[PDB]
Design a protein around this nucleic acid. Structure first.
Ligand SMILES: [Zn+2]
Ligand SMILES: [Zn+2]
Lengths: 77, 410
DNA sequence: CATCAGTTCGAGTCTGGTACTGCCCAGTAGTGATCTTATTT
DNA sequence: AAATAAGATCACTACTGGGCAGTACCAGACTCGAACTGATG
């Protein structure tokens, strides 16, 4: 995908995370969504997709920040 | 655990028995913070603060922290800074070593520029915010900015001298000498049995003039580089020279300030270098003794007093219109000055009273209009319908709002 | 005599001691909905 | 294991302290233009 990345921007070839064993009894889908969004959304800061959920935006250093106020369905969206 | 402004307003202001101290404890004592340079000074405010702090703390050595010992020997002209000066290296060293962080009195003298202990200059601006800070403020903290509340100490000073080997080294040596002399002066403030008087300066001048200029004030004045009229002002009248002039004289004589103040050690010495060194030839003089006629100023001020204008000007406006200085006018005519100042003050008081009674009237009218539509009248909702939604800080606008709500049942 | 040093008068400039104006924000205690965790049967 | 409690958190609302950038005044005081006047080589 290197020629495609050079020709077309805002497209990540492959994204991969590893599932987390939850601290609690049940699997944490909230943390899964947060970590997937963090890992996927690390291109150059030029690609500002301004997700339609408030509470997920860029910062001064270009990292992804998500506060605890964002609910799991909003993270999934 | 309280802010210094809160402590002064709620515990130090009531104890003092001055009108502006009791009246300023319910409004924000900005008078004592805009003029905090005189709290460490030789004046009456410093003495009163020392006495009230002594009463609050039951201490006996608080007068050493000020210059009240040097009241009759030192003048307040150019002696104290307007802004806080600190050595960041001093703060960092005191905090790292576990010692308490404190502000020394030596930093409060304008003549001092660099810290003798650390060989770096005193920084007078917060590194994080380029904002000036007074000596004492509402949110003052030892080592923290009184405007942003962040640490002011650093391992290395952020200000560095320019690259120059012509006069920078000489200026640095001069600054070190002044720092050492002023520090030793402060140290000797406690050792002396009694405060030296002004007549010590006269006796010292009588010795040095006879010893270097063979009883000639003009030659001495030319040597140091200050006008001979000021020498006459000093040596035969009760006028105390500024600390800068005394330090310059002592530097030219190689004899320290404390050794110059004593009239005994001056007798047994034979200065020779003072004649050798003289580097004061080009000094910029004052502008001019501008003309001042009693008849013209008196007629103009009588006309402005009789003439009714709106609103009645303050005296700075009158002086600026005349292109003069306030002190020059007030020296000859202090009575009509007070008359004009009064007229303006009563006009301002009447205007404030009428405007604020009106503001209460609109407050009542707005609460009427808001309760007419059924919406709950709160302070914020009423504030949203006012040109200046801050008038409730007055403690009768809020009273009128509360009375109007309680009459209506809230 | 004309040059220079000791003397007065008064304005430029500081500065403390005293007094007062004009305006909104913040900290806190409630309720209501909605998690997240914790006891019952 | 399902059902029932209960604390935590977010969000909004109403209430009540309460201070800072800024102006103003009043003589006391220092410093030195500008000049006045007397001794002197
Ligand atoms: Zn230091
Ligand atoms: Zn700061």
């Amino acid at each position: 995908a290197l020629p495609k990345l050079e020709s077309d921007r805002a497209r990540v070839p492959v994204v991969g995370i590893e599932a987390i064993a939850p601290e609690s009894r049940y699997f944490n889908w909230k943390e899964y969504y947060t970590r997937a969004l963090i890992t996927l959304e690390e291109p150059l800061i030029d690609h500002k997709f301004d997700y339609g959920v408030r509470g997920i935006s860029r910062d001064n250093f270009g990292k992804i920040n998500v506060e605890s106020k964002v609910v799991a369905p909003a993270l999934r969206r | 655990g309280v802010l210094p402004g809160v402590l002064m307003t709620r515990e130090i202001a009531p104890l003092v028995n001055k009108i502006y101290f009791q009246n300023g404890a319910n409004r924000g004592f900005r008078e004592i913070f805009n003029r905090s340079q005189a709290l460490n000074g030789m004046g009456e405010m410093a003495a009163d603060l020392v006495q009230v702090l002594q009463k609050l703390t039951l201490r006996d050595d608080l007068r050493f922290l000020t210059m009240l010992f040097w009241s009759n020997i030192l003048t307040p002209r150019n002696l104290f800074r307007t802004r806080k000066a600190w050595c960041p290296i001093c703060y960092q060293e005191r905090h790292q070593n576990g010692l308490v962080v404190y502000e020394q009195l030596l930093w409060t003298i304008n003549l001092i520029t660099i810290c003798p202990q650390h060989q770096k200059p005193l920084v007078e601006l917060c590194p994080h915010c380029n904002h000036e800070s007074p000596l004492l403020n509402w949110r003052s903290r030892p080592g923290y900015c009184s405007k942003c509340g962040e640490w002011l100490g650093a391992n290395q000073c952020l200000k560095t001298f320019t690259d120059g080997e012509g006069s920078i080294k000489l200026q640095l040596e001069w600054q070190y000498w002044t720092a050492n002399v002023v520090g030793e002066l402060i140290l000797a403030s406690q050792c002396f049995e009694s405060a030296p008087s002004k007549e010590n300066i006269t006796k010292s001048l009588n010795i040095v003039i006879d010893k270097v200029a063979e009883n000639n004030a003009a030659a001495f004045s030319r040597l140091i580089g200050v006008p001979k009229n000021s020498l006459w002002m000093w040596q035969s009248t009760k006028t105390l020279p500024e600390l800068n002039t005394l330090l310059k004289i002592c530097y030219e004589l190689e004899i320290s300030l404390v050794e110059f103040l004593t009239p005994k050690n001056l007798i047994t010495k034979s200065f020779t270098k003072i004649s050798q060194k003289h580097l004061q030839l080009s000094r910029t003089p004052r502008v001019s003794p501008k003309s001042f006629d009693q008849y013209q100023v008196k007629d103009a001020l009588l006309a402005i007093l009789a003439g009714n204008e709106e609103p009645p000007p303050t005296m700075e406006e009158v002086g600026k219109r005349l292109g003069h200085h306030n002190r020059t006018i007030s020296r000859h005519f202090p009575d009509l000055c007070s008359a004009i100042s009064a007229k303006c003050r009563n006009y301002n008081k009447a205007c404030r009273l009428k405007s604020i009674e009106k503001l209460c009237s609109e407050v009542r009218e707005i609460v009427l209009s808001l309760n007419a539509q059924g919406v709950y009248p709160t302070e914020g909702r009423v504030c949203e319908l006012m040109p200046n939604p801050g008038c409730f800080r007055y403690k009768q606008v809020r009273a009128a709002f509360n009375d109007a709500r309680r009459e209506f049942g809230l």
